Amino acid sequence: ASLWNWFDITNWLWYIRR
Amino acid sequence: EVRLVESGGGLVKPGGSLRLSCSASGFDFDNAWMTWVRQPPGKGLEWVGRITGPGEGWSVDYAESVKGRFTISRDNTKNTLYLEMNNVRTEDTGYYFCARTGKYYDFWSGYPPGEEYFQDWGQGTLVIVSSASTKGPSVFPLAPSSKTAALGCLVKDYFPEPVTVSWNSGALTSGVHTFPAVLQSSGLYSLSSVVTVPSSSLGTQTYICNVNHKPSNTKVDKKVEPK
Amino acid sequence: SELTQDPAVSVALKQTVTITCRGDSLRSHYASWYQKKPGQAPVLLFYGKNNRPSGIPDRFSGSASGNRASLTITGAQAEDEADYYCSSRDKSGSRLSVFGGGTKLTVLSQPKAAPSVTLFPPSSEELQANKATLVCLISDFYPGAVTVAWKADSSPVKAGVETTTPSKQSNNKYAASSYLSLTPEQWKSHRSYSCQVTHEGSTVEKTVAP
């Protein structure tokens, strides 16, 4: 999970739900 | 198992520089986010800044009142967090904590970039910002005033800590209260020591405060009398 | 102040108390809670939606609604007396974090006690040194949370005010002190000076005249 950029993960996971 | 130890605190002049270190153990330091938090004397916790991990390019964020003067870095080969303080101001005085920072984001109800929480803390290292050098105190009497009465001594404009105050060479200890020292904007400390006595003994008993300031090798004995 | 907390709250032994945190970012971000005792490192108590770290008693729990976060202690114990801090983002979507002002929680072990207020005018010895300090002594109050205000005549004073955090006396009650720094000309130019201490909604005042 740390391999990705955290600020980008949560932003991507927010786009999926919305 | 988790251990965080701050070091490097001390006295620094305004406009000077200082580097705080935090050595960590008991967890995967490389992938851990690390945060600096400070607490001014008598005040609350203040977020200073945080450094992220490898997936974020080790990016660092700072508090607005801190940007431009502090630099946070890490040395993953020595398991150490660093806080470089430049152009240090008097408001930077306080205890500095390092904290292992966790990351949280609820998929269904969260909002990017989630929230950061502090699972483990160090015990903190004290930083004092003052232009002052060693100075003995000026002791002023606080004449008895209605509370029973209260009388005492005002121990003014000394540096550095500490100062001890006794009364009648230690023979008077009932009712005695010595307050914690306040650090003024001038960089000097001041405190008060007070004793509560019955009003019927103001003209019959003598009260002498004994002020000892070892950092300046100064002793003062001051008798407190009614006006 | 992005996150606001009540400065002081009191709870009876074995009863329930709620400590609230308010701010704009709480409508979009969760909060975490921290217990802080003198001379000890902070302890994370609760974070996220419903996360309590292991080793923390189950009487601590967190909730949120609107722009409010809340920490509830169910059946408060004597060791729960400490300062409690909330933390979250400073703005919605921000990479910065911020702490609330903090809340002093007292688990009542004594009856409430109103403070005594003693006021010491500038000593003649200090006025000859071209200085003037008003010393306000606040003692014998419980719980240890007071607000101090200074007045010159009927106006609030500006600068030169310093106040210490309350501390325990020998009789487990609290004392505090406040200092008003004046020049000798300022001291002799007002009709009176007042030290006003508010404790549990009640104010106790002391007035001196030059």
Does the beta-carbon distance from C42 to B118 stay under 8 Å? yes
Q: What architecture (CATH level 2) is domain C110-210?
A: Sandwich (2.60)
Max Cα distance, chain A (Å): 24
Residue whose entry in the numeric block shows the structure tokens 């911020």: C98
CA C198, C199, C204 angle in degrees (round to 5)?
50
The residue in chain C having the minimum alpha-carbon distance to the alpha carbon of residue B117 is C32
Dihedral angle over CA of C60, B125, B177, B147, nearest 10 = -70
CB atoms within 10 A of CB C88: 27
Kindly state the tokens that stand for C97: 């974090």
User: Which residues have a Cβ under 8 Å from the Cβ of B174 and sit 6 or more positions away?
Assistant: none
C58 phi and psi, to 5 degrees?
Answer: -70, -5
Answer whether B46's CB lies under 8 Å from B37's CB.
Answer: yes
B-proximal residues of C, 125-144, CB under 8 Å: 125-126, 129, 133, 135, 137, 139
For chain A, the distance separating the N- and C-terminal CA atoms, rounded to the nearest angstrom, is 22
Say whether both B4 and B111 belong to one domain: yes
Burial class of residue C100 (count of CB atoms within 10 Å of its CB; 0-12, 13-18, 19+): buried
B177 and B159 assigned to the same domain: yes
Q: Are residues B88 and B147 in the same domain?
A: no
Of B77, B112, B131, which closes a domain?
B131
How, if at all, do strands C202-208 and C193-199 pair? antiparallel
The whole-angstrom separation of Cα C80 and Cα B85 is 35
**Strand duo C202-208 + B125-129: pairing:** unpaired
Same domain, B93 and B50: yes
Residue whose C-alpha is closest to residue C48's, from C33, C27, C66: C33
> B41 preceded by cis ω (within 30°)?
no
Instruction: Return the number of other C-beta atoms located less than 10 Å from residue C136's C-beta.
Output: 25
Q: Which of B80, B110, B131 is the last residue of a domain?
A: B131
Fill in the DSSP letter of residue C123: P
* Site of tokens 């949120």: C64
Q: Which of B29, B33, B107, B109 to mutate to test the interface with A (most CBs of A within 10 A)?
A: B107
Q: Which domain holds residue B94?
A: 1-131
Please indicate, yes or no, whether residues B165 and B127 belong to a single structural domain of this protein. Answer: no
Provide the CA B58 distance to its chain's centre, in angstroms. Answer: 30
Domain CATH number, residue B32: 2.60.40.10
Please indicate, yes or no, whether residues B89 and B113 belong to a single structural domain of this protein.
yes
Contacts with B, A 1-18, CB within 8 Å:
2-7, 9-11, 13-14, 17
| Statement to judge: residues B118 and B141 lie in one domain | no
Neighbouring chains of B at 3+ CB pairs under 8 Å are A, C
Do residues C119 and C134 make contact, with C-beta atoms less than 8 angstroms apart?
Answer: yes
Single-letter amino acid, residue B54:
P
Structural contact between residues C52 and C58, judged by C-beta atoms closer than 8 angstroms: yes
- B interface mutation test: which of A8, A10, A12 has the most B CBs within 10 A? A10
The closest CB to that of A5, out of B56, B107, B114, belongs to: B56
Nearest chain C residue to B102 by CA distance is: C47
What does the angle CA B68 – CA B69 – CA B75 come to, to the nearest 5 degrees? 105
For residues A15 and B158, what is the distance between their CA atoms, to the nearest angstrom? 60
Domain C110-210 in the same topology as domain C1-109? yes
CB B6 within 8 A of CB B16: no
| One domain, residues B124 and B144 | no
Q: Inter-chain contact B55–A4, Cβ cutoff 8 Å?
A: yes
Task: Among B131, B164, B187, identify where a domain stops.
Answer: B131
Is A10 in Cβ contact with B105 (below 8 Å)? yes
CA B128 vs CA B9, B73, B155, C113, C164: distances in Å: 8, 22, 20, 35, 18
Subunits that touch chain A (at least 3 Cβ pairs < 8 angstroms)?
B
How remote is the C-alpha of C86 from its chain's centroid?
A: 15
Same domain, B212 and B222: yes
**Cβ A6–B54 below 8 Å, yes or no?**
no
- What span, in angstroms and rounded, lies between the C-alpha atoms of B84 and B1? 27
Assess contact for A8 and B104: CB atoms under 8 A. Answer: no
- Whether residue B117 contacts residue B102, with contact meaning beta carbons closer than 8 Å, is answered with yes
Show the DSSP H helices in C112-158 as ranges.
124-128
Convert chain B into a string of H (helix), E (strand) and C (coil).
CCEEEEECCCEECCCCCEEEEEEEECCCCCCCEEEEEEECCCCCCEEEEEECCHHHCCCEEECCCCCCCEEEEEECCCCEEEEEECCCCHHHCEEEEEEEEEEECCCCCCCCCCEEEEEEECCCEEEEECCCCCECCEEEEEEEEECCEEEEEEEEEEECCCCEEEEHHHCCCCCEEECCCEECCCCCEEEEEEEEECHHHCCCCCEEEEEEEHHHCEEEEEEECCC
Cis peptide before C57 (omega within 30 of 0): no
Rounded Cα gap, residues C1 and C26, in angstroms: 13
Neighbouring C-beta atoms of residue B9, cutoff 10 Å: 17
Statement to judge: residues B75 and B148 lie in one domain? no
Q: Which of A7, A14, A17 sits opposite B56 (nearest CB)?
A: A7
Count structural domains, chain B. 2
Amino acid occupying residue C82: A
Q: Nearest CA to B94 among B38, B10, B21?
A: B38
Q: What are the tokens at C127?
A: 């006025």
CA distance A15 to chain B (A): 10
Q: Which of B52, B106, B156, B179 to mutate to test the interface with C (most CBs of C within 10 A)?
A: B179
Query: Based on the domain organization, do B174 and B188 belong to the same domain?
Result: yes
Q: Which of C89, C100, C163 sits opposite B115 (nearest CB)?
A: C89
Q: Give the minimum alpha-carbon distance from B105 to chain A in angstroms, rounded to a whole number.
A: 7
Q: Could you give phi then psi for residue C184, rounded to 5 degrees? A: -55, -35
Domain C1-109 has CATH 3.40.50.2300: no
Chain centre to alpha carbon of residue B33: 25
**CA-derived radius of gyration, chain A:** 8
Size of interface B-C (CB pairs under 8 A): 141
Q: Where are the domains of chain C?
A: 1-109, 110-210
Give yes or no for C210 touching B (CB within 8 A): no
Q: Are B222 and B211 in contact (CB under 8 A)?
A: yes
Contacts with B37 from chain C: Cβ below 8 Å: 42, 99
Give whole-number Cα distances, B106 to B103, C18, C28, C51, in Å.
Answer: 10, 24, 11, 11
Phi, psi of C22 (to 5 degrees): -130, 140
Structure-solving method? X-ray
Report yes or no: B113 and A11 within 8 Å, Cβ to Cβ: yes
Closest residue of chain B to A3, computed from CA coordinates: B55
Query: Rounded CA gap, C141 and C186, in Å?
Result: 31
Name which of B43, B147, B224 is nearest C136 in CA terms.
Answer: B147
List Cβ neighbours of B68 (8 Å cut-off, separation of 6 or more): B87
Report yes or no: C74 and C62 within 8 Å, Cβ to Cβ.
no
Note whether C139 contacts B196, CB cutoff 8 Å.
Answer: yes
- Whether residues B55 and B94 share a domain: the answer is yes
